[PDB]
């Protein structure tokens, strides 16, 4: 039962990571709004919240990596294998998105110092590209998994359904992440 128990736990690890990511995205959105209001014309607390959620997500990603390793090892039919791979896919998307979020945080902080880049751009582009491919690969795995269900009870179908909601939440998070990159690029243009 160690695989099935690990797969269930890994679903909760991923949800918790995505939740923590969501709070972090809201903080970067606040930061950008505040910056725009000053060029139109609390930061110590903002730093602390950024540092707290950054630490939290780091520890949640570490737990999810360690659980992934355990499940992949216990795995060694196609359904379970698909479910484990889809956990890996989602995890990779979260790791990638977190790095993009940390690049946006860096941008905010630079802009902030001047209201108190070529390499940045290149890294944003590289990770954005990566994330698009990981989302595409998760969508493909999700179709596959849904097809395997047609050909363990309601437990496995339930997990497949929740993985669809986790991917949906990653996609929504990417939509808003990409919006913060556009906002930081608009602010960058204005100071240059």
């Amino acid at each position, epitope marked *: 039962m160690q695989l099935l128990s690990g797969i269930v736990q890994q679903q909760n690890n991923l949800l918790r990571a995505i939740e923590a990511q969501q709070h972090l995205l809201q903080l970067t*959105v606040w930061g*950008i*709004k505040q910056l*725009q*209001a000053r060029i*139109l014309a609390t930061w110590m607390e903002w730093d602390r919240e950024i540092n707290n959620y950054t630490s939290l997500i780091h520890s949640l990603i570490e737990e999810s990596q360690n659980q992934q390793e355990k499940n992949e090892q216990e795995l060694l039919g196609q359904l379970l294998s698909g479910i484990v791979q889809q956990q890996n896919n989602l995890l990779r998307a979260i790791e990638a998105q977190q790095h993009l979020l940390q690049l946006t945080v860096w941008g905010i902080k630079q802009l902030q110092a001047r209201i108190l880049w070529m390499e940045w*751009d290149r890294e944003i*582009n590289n990770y954005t*590209s990566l994330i*698009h491919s990981l989302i595409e690969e998760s969508q493909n795995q999700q179709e596959k998994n849904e097809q395997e269900l047609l050909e363990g009870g309601q437990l496995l179908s339930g997990i497949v359904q929740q993985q669809n909601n986790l991917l949906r939440a990653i*996609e929504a998070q*990417q*939509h*808003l992440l*990409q*919006l913060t990159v*556009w*906002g930081i*690029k*608009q*602010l960058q*243009a*204005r100071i240059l």
Partner: antibody
Amino acid sequence: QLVQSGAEVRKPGASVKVSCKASGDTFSSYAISWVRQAPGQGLEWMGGIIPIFGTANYAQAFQGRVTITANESTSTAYMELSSLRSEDTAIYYCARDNPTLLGSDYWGAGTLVTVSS
Amino acid sequence: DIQMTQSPSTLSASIGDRVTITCRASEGIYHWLAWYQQKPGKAPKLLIYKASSLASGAPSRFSGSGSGTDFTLTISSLQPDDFATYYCQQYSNYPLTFGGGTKLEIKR
């Protein structure tokens, strides 16, 4: 989904402010672009705003003369073009820039602005 | 700013023919390139986003290709509704910029 204000006539040197009304959803997760097209000519990007931040960017040609604002309380975006000359006569479109697509998925119907005496 | 150049400016082809049009950026824009279709009297319509993805409501006879600085839109077999002006637009960096357009005309 994007409702624009009615056609306008202005004299040279005057200004015009055109509006684009969207939903709640648009203003909380999308960007708004303004794009114009003189009769028989091509599309020209004027600028854009991201309402949740208030950030904006303008094309080089209109720096100095264009202002884009958006007030979240009415989900309305506006484009104000100053020092109007006759070559500004065009259809002015608002467009919703979708960050999942990196493209414009919805357009308003366009607003005729005619600049003449 | 980033300059977009479309080629050719105009093109004639029979209904049923294949065509390719091209868009070139003055600097690398990765895959951040969209194509739009416009009929006279109408707003533009997104057909392709991120260089090669079909937008909702765009038929499979359309495809896009390319990366960096050189991009292409291909229609494998033209139907009456495809004769229109096509614009590219880069979404790599602000300010955003359109190509000059390619008008497609029916040959008879």
